[PDB]
Amino acid sequence: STNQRVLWWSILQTLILVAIGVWQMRHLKSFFEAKKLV
Amino acid sequence: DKLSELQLRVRQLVEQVEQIQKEQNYQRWREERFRQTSESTNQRVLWWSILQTLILVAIGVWQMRHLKSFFEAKKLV
Amino acid sequence: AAKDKLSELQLRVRQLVEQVEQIQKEQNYQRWREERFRQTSESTNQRVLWWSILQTLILVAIGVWQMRHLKSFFEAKKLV
Amino acid sequence: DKLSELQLRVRQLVEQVEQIQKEQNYQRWREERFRQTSESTNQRVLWWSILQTLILVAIGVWQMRHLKSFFEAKKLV
Amino acid sequence: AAKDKLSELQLRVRQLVEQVEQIQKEQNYQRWREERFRQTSESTNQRVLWWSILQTLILVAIGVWQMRHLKSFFEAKKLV
Amino acid sequence: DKLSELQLRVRQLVEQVEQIQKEQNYQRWREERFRQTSESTNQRVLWWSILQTLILVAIGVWQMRHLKSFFEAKKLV
Amino acid sequence: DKLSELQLRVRQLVEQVEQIQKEQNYQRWREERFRQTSESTNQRVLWWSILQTLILVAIGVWQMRHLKSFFEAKKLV
Amino acid sequence: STNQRVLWWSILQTLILVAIGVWQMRHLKSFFEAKKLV
């Protein structure tokens, strides 16, 4: 059943990288208005 | 009597071959099924690794375009 | 009756030799099947290793390009 | 005579099963060994992937730390 | 001696019967390594036909992006 | 009495062999036919590659033409 | 009286059953090697098609680079 | 032997696409100096 397991990792790795990209995009959005003030 | 002895010997020999052939029935099937499975899994893990790369690159870009579009609209508003 | 009792035995042993040889052959094939599966699976494992490794490079390169295109874009935006 | 001849033939056949049997056993061992190495290969592929995911998140965070830092530097100078 | 003969023959049927049985089992497997393989082959062929379609789209998209980045680059260069 | 059972069982194995040698032939037809199918599938792939290399290059030249008409036409008018 | 012929019927049967066993084996040789070859060649096509995409994209980007590095240097000279 | 016949066509297709890209890259180079004159 390992075969599945690594496949689960592929399908939940994808999710974590997408999540990190979205938070990256949110961090910059929250970073902009502070950058203009400084 | 020698003949008889040969007959006792050939019978045992021919029953130690049913057994041998059945072991090799059983081993083949088992082994091939495992082989199959492993192989298929490797190609899933390599047909999805590539989809994953494609979707990761698209979103990444897309997102940047979104940042250069809604961020740009912020300045006009 | 013993002669018939030897002829049947020589048919049976002939029919045993036939079965054993069809089994030997069988066995040689199984041992050659194995080599092939040690080289298709080896090839696929090498292929997936090269793919993961180069997928890592692709993602890192796109990340760096993304950074360099974003930094200049902010710089350029401030000037106009 | 025939008897003796038959015996000889039979002797050859008798050998030809022990080897076959012996070899079946060898085959079985090797199959199993390969099964075990394939089990370790999937586990080596698994660590790799997770290592890579960690690497990618570290690089995301450095990237985000970095450009932002540069901007800050510009604003302080 | 016939009793002997009959038993040679009843026993004869006993090894042969199993011969057929085994054979039957292998045929069952065979029809199992053919249906399965057909489906496996279909899957792999699907993969190549969809990667083909995917590769074509990737090359076309990169060509269009190349054309849009070159056109603007020349126009921007003329202005500065 | 035993001979009647034996002859029925033998008839009862001839049918099985006949069945088995009938079905084996059916399996052999399934195989040859499959060889024809796999070959046909590879042929389409080849054409699809030469279609895809045709679609790709005309576009290439095509693209270039578009570029000339986006720059050259502006100069004329 | 049938017994002698029963011995014969059986003989015919085992002349054919072994033959079935031979043919069956031959069909598994012929359609085993063929499937490994077909699977291996499709896997290699799919792998090299993927590699071909990577090399094609790399050169494209480098074409851009070289049409902007050396073209840019043309204006300064 | 059709397998070798598809692999060779893949390689030839790679070569032809690279050749078309280079030719493209040469056509624009020969196009520039004419563009500046017009």
Author numbering:
A (entry chain G), H (entry chain H): 198 to 235
B (entry chain A), D (entry chain C), F (entry chain F), G (entry chain D): 159 to 235
C (entry chain B), E (entry chain E): 156 to 235
Q: Which passages does the manuscript contain on this structure?
A:
An unexpected feature of the TMED9 oligomers is an intrinsic symmetry mismatch between the CC and TM domains. Specifically, we noted that each TM tetramer has internal twofold symmetry, and twofold symmetry is also evident between the TM tetramers. Within the TM domain interface, residues L214 and L225 constitute two layers of Leu-mediated hydrophobic interactions. Within the CC domain interface, four layers of Ile/Leu-mediated hydrophobic interactions are centered at residues L161, L164, L171, and I178. PIP (36:2) fits well with the cryo-EM density at both the headgroup and the acyl chains. The PIP headgroup between the TM tetramers is within hydrogen bonding distance to the R223 and H224 side chains from two of the four subunits at the tetramer-tetramer interface; these interactions could further stabilize octameric, dodecameric, or higher-order TMED9 complexes. The importance of the observed molecular interactions is supported by delayed elution from the gel filtration column for CC domain mutation E190R, the PIP-interacting residue mutation R223E and CC interface mutations Q177A, R191E, and W205A, all of which compromised TMED9 oligomerization. In addition, we used mass photometry, a label-free single-molecule technique for mass determination, and found that wild-type (WT) TMED9 has a mass distribution consistent with octamers and higher-order oligomers (such as dodecamers).
TMED9 is a member of the TMED family of cargo receptors that facilitate the bidirectional transport of membrane proteins at the endoplasmic reticulum (ER)–Golgi interface via anterograde COPII and retrograde COPI vesicles. In addition, all TMEDs share a conserved domain architecture with luminal Golgi-dynamics (GOLD) and coiled-coil (CC) domains and a single TM domain. Sorting signals for COPI (dilysine motif, KK) and COPII (diphenylalanine motif, FF) coatomer proteins are contained in the cytosolic tail of TMED9. Here, we report cryo–electron microscopy (cryo-EM) structures of full-length TMED9 in octameric and dodecameric forms.
